[model samples]
Target: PRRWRRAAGAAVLLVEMLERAAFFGVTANLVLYLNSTNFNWTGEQATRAALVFLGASYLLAPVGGWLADVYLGRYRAVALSLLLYLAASGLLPATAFPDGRSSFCGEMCAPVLYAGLLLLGLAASSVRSNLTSFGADQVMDLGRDATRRFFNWFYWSINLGAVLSLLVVAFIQQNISFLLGYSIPVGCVGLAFFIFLFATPVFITKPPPQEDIANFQVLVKILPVMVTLVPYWMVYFQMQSTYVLQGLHLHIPNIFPIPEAWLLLANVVVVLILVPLKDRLIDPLLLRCKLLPSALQKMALGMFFGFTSVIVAGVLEMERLHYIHHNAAPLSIWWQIPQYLLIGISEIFASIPGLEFAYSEAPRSMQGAIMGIFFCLSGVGSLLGSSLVALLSLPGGWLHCPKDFGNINNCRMDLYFFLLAGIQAVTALLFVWIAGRYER
Candidate 1:
């Protein structure tokens, strides 16, 4: 029995690692992929489309969670999601291919690709929201020590996957053909599904028959709070969409050779290096010193860091413009490193802990549902980004032009970053205020 349990635990960890490897491998490249000339989308159009894809995935997560909780059991839902994910990942590479050579019909490929993304969203929602809860179920004891160890290792395992995915896959995308870059994720997803299926018989299962009614009622009561978090998510998601786009336009000194797309790897690297130490030593030491922040307080602090990150980014943007105005070489891409590092630190505080708080505060049966809610917040953030971009593009806004920009300065993104930073700062204050009154 001991050996079986150990095997099951390893299997679960393997699934998580591979799933993240597949997911991030694609996500790390997605923004750049969308904007690539091979896809024939303008930068603005690509940003909008990427937002829709990412945002829609978050929107679908709750529905997927509900279905898992109320209808399909966790194991079945995961298996089905894996199947769908494999198919979608397989299709992604083909989307980059032009009409003549691909197996799918010529003009229909784009629509087919869009449909694949919807399926991918469904799969992601099912997988991400449930996987952690399912892992928690594997614990034989609910004692504090056991739970602590489980969470510590769990976080480390996820970050390990992320680090490998970012390092290996980012390198591939940077060096290889775009199709090959996309295909690697497809292979990873397929392998993950197979591994998951093979280990199913040995793993513990949390079927739907064990729903906790009282907990369900409590979660339902707090639904309003979940709804209220949408605005927070909207502002948070710009790190990828608007922020990344702006970073690409910035002048980077040549000393740092990192690409704008690869700058995201800094966050993963920080998480990888700091997570274990944070879990094993920093957190315990902080608790001893009575300096450990409550989860909500941590989240608030994270929001503040995120706000600061945006301000740093905004400063960098202004600097880029200053150089552009004088015809100096563009700012070194490395200048964006500080903002990325700050975002990573903020995520460590806000996003990771918020996910834990959301899951632990909710009832067991509704774990998936709550995770979905968390992801939905991110979706809201993406939508907000899209809306902001659209708003700026309107006739009188900063992005609007008199149709006569002989110089690139007129099209610079400095104003956008300034506006985003101000908005984020206000939101961080609101989060702190609300955290004071939050029940859980």
Candidate 2:
């Protein structure tokens, strides 16, 4: 039974990898897509739209969890979510070729596009909320070390897909064709959904639902940590929006003109390399010194790094603005690598441990629900970022430029980065204080 359970955990990780690959395939380049000729949206418009969609997806995660916990089982919820995801993926491709001559959604492109996003958001919520907890169910009997190890492995699989999507799918979409790019993710999801059904008998699903009063206690205890994490995610989400937007102005090599979204590769690649190193090398060294930090402490440290990343980004932006002022030549995109690498390191310390904390602290049946709420906070963070941008772009605001140089040049993106860094610094201090007093 133990052997099969461990194998079952591996199966779940494989499914997560496929699902994430499909998810990031659409998202990594989504802002670019909206800004492309098809949509012809401005940078602010595209950034706002993408963040809202991403935020909604995270917010809806709790709904998926509730359905899994109260109505459908985790297995059923995950399966249904995948089917919905496939349907959404199929619909999104039509938006690429929205011409009057063709049938499906001709001239009604925005309607179909939004419809697809809505379905994708809901499907993502369901899967994100349930799948990790379901994986946890398989390994619960194995104890804490195994559970922590599984969480590390699980996050690694997620980043594997993220890296692949940023490299392959984003490249195809930017350099080749949108129709082909959109179709590939749909196919990836289809394969995973099919394979997942085959692994049905191997899974260890939850029993029928039962209300537990202790669930509320767990929620209360976790809320402080969750609240502190909101600013971390707010800063984190800028990587998907402002960071990519910034890269669009940078110098591109003729030999390998990487897409703006592909700049995210540094962050995901760092995650891929560092996860194992920490698991095998760093943690053991810390253990030997009897100085291994608690999960909350790790998260606080990660938040501090998150603050530092934005500070570096601010300095880089200031440099870029100065260089462009002197000459027409653009700054090298490689200069942005350090900020991304820092963000990656922050994730290893913050998010992975945060995930493990959510799972380990929750009551058995409420695992999915708790995890859903955790994701919901991330949604709030994304939305908060959008709101900040919206406000700052108003008249006489930081993002409101007096003159237009087209790219992010005339705008005070350095100020924005510095502001975010300041916010994160305050949040890190609060997190440290809370984490020190937190019990269990």
Candidate 3:
């Protein structure tokens, strides 16, 4: 009799995929919801609100990560957090439906809304950092190749869920009922919580937290990499909010009824195609040429990709604005494809490798903490974006568009995007210089 036992890691992957779909479903087109006249918020205010929600989500990963490593242990920590996850997020559907509240930022509604968002961030922090290391816990003893394989599919699975949310969930919300859009993801989250439990009994033991080596020494070395990632995220995450707004302003009569988010499908599509292609065509050739990228080099290359993605996006904004200024036929939002494709490529080069790098480099006792710190970079990025976006609206600031997308502009959005791209270019070179000097 030949019998094969399923790896517990496979179960975690299934849970991760569903969890991603559940979260991304809530996030998809959320900016549109916030920016809707229902909220009556200024353009900057709406975007800043979006940033706070996102930044807090990533920022608190370290807190939950610490709890898993120190107190509850990985499995218990994950279970507790999932429990907290459902409890916190359950309030969200009520905010969207139940009493049928629409206007957030209003005194009565604002308190409940912000609190729910914050609580969701806290719960997700556990899942984000804990589950990340937990999956690795299953595979690490197997070897580095197994670990890398686990991460690639983890990245792919995440994006697969995101694609589902953008395409299907958004379609339902826009075409059907907002209550279904908001409510269904909550159910999906609970579904993931249970799936994770079913897989729990078989999980590989999470080793006790370790500190035999000088832990501070490793942190010192990794801090530069952490700092380098913040700028990259500032550029990347705008895809979730600002990019959606940018698409709305485009004059595409041909695709009038089509959702702007449908174009966002480009990110995942490129990811799906390139994940395999990179492994097959790119890595093999590089190895054959004896020019395989070091982790540092891969991250630097990804930053260059970010630099270019935003450059392309900036150029598109210029064209879109011009079409608007002339009152000409709307330029097709399809023009955003190049930028979206490059951002996806950048994630492969910069983000996926960064995840691998952080997990692999971390001392055993500190793997979850280090990974949490890595995710915290996105929080830093989001905060910087929020601050900078506010500053740029000052009387003489470089970015000066009216709050509303439809509002006319002498706003020179082209200048703003290019400036960020320029900063990214410098950061890329700076990262290479720093990385070249590292003892590794």
Candidate 4:
């Protein structure tokens, strides 16, 4: 009866990939967009604003989760969210003109941008909360280990979307024009909506709601793991904010300049290459050798790499600062590659495994809700990152150097990176302890 089961199950995967492409097309470059003359925002202002929007985006995931689990069902929630997403994205490109002037908006540009971003966030969270879990529903009858492979492929599609969008959209924004760049995502979402509607017949729709909500026992067990993710995300979120700001100081090639955000492509590229390699080569070899790491162990190892990447970033920042002080040629942006690669490896180990663990741990009825909770915690991390920036941007703070006229040059960004490394180290230690006691 379900002869086309795998094909049907993977249909949502393609929709999700398109969704991510649309999402990253804007978000990956959002901070920079805010900093442009259209808004005339300072780096700190831009970063804070972007993170706040991002924070709210994931924070609303649970709302979608609850709606799907209780009333709407995943399919309806996703379809509705995609419509909202299209509307929100459409409103964005209208905010800017072809000449890159905000004169049309005057003082209204910031408010309009904020409105677009907020609605975009809400819609994205709704789709994110339900889509992957909905796809999982299609394949769960294949058993536990098989479901893990679905997540791997799901995650791989996610990065593939990120990679393609980053490469294309970032280039267009940096070299071509922001209006064109932003418009592309709108088209991507539009196409995603069409494909999603066509695939409707193949989806595995849920039965009507039962009286039982999620059991507290499994929720309690997952909380500690979720808590440990906060610091990891706090650091990971930096790639979009402080990391891009740092790139502004580096010596990018003048011949064919690349966007600083393109540097994040390093992370996704590694994920694209390694996810397949791990599935075909590394996991099999480890299984044969009886050395396959548990989900918790992989997460712990990923945390270690997370720590290592920031430490490397800190050292690189220090070196870059030295070159700045000496009035020598600026350090090449290529030096930042290792740190990006390390963070990529960290995601390979930590992010996907953590997601699989959450899905596997949930009672069947609560899968969407559980996934929402997982993303909500990540939203917490984004908010935490915003708080940290706000705190550190206070007078005489590590990130605050009023005397330097709000420039990153005099600010202690190296110190900021080192501080994140310290936090990640502590989180890794706490995660190991938690993993030891956590019986899956």
Give lDDT tens digits, candidate 4, residues 1-440. Answer: 05665776566677787887788677655556567644655354533354466577788777767776668766777777788787766556554544433443554457656676766776788787788777666657665556667777788888887677656775777787776777788877877777777766766677632336347766677788787778778767765456666766555566663454455565577788878976777666766888667776777777788778777788887887787687634476877767766777787878778887776676776677788878888788888776776677765366564335335444777667787778788888888877777875
* lDDT (10s digit) by residue, model 3, range 1-440: 01211456666767777776666665443444445535445233432453466577788778768767777776777777777767756655555553535444433644554565666676777777778887776657665656666677778777776677556775777688777777777777777767776665676666552555578777777687677767667766655455666766666554454554455565577788777777667766766787767666777778788777777787777777677677644465676767767777888887678887786577677677787778788887877766676576666444446456546655666776777777777777777776866657
Listed per candidate, the RMSD to the true structure in angstroms reads 5.4, 4.8, 5.2, 5.3
Q: Candidate 3 — which residues are off by over 4 angstroms?
A: 1-10, 24-51, 89-115, 167-183, 209-213, 239-258, 310-336, 394-397, 402-408
Per-candidate TM-scores read 0.74, 0.79, 0.79, 0.77
Per-residue CA lDDT of model 1 for 1-440, tens digit only, reads 23465666676777788887777666545555445534444345532454476577888888888887778888788877887876766556555655432555544434554576678778877887777777666653344445545655666677778778767785788787777887788777777677777877766666673446666666664554455566556666656645556554544455555454454555566666656666777677867788767666777777788778877877776776677568645476766667777776776776666766675576666667778877887787777656765666664355543234314335545666677677777676656555554664
Query: Model 2 over residues 1-440: C-alpha lDDT tens digits?
Result: 24576667767777787777777677644556456545534344543454477688898777767776767776777777888886766555544554521564243444555666667877887787677877776656677667767777888888886676556765677788767777788777877777777777876556641346666666676788788788777777765557766766565557653444455565577788878887888766766787667666677677778878788788887888788677645475777777777877788878777887776687666567788888888898888766766676665356454235335444766667787777888788778777766774
lDDT of each: 0.66, 0.70, 0.68, 0.70
The residue ranges of model 2 lying beyond 4 angstroms of the native Cα positions read: 4-10, 24-51, 86-116, 166-186, 209-214, 239-258, 314-336, 394-397, 400-410
- Candidate 2 CA-lDDT value: 0.70
TM-score of 3: 0.79
Name the candidate, 1 or 2, with the larger TM-score value. 2
Worst 10 residues of 3 by lDDT: 1-10
Ranking by lDDT: 2, 4, 3, 1
Clashes of each: 10, 0, 2, 0
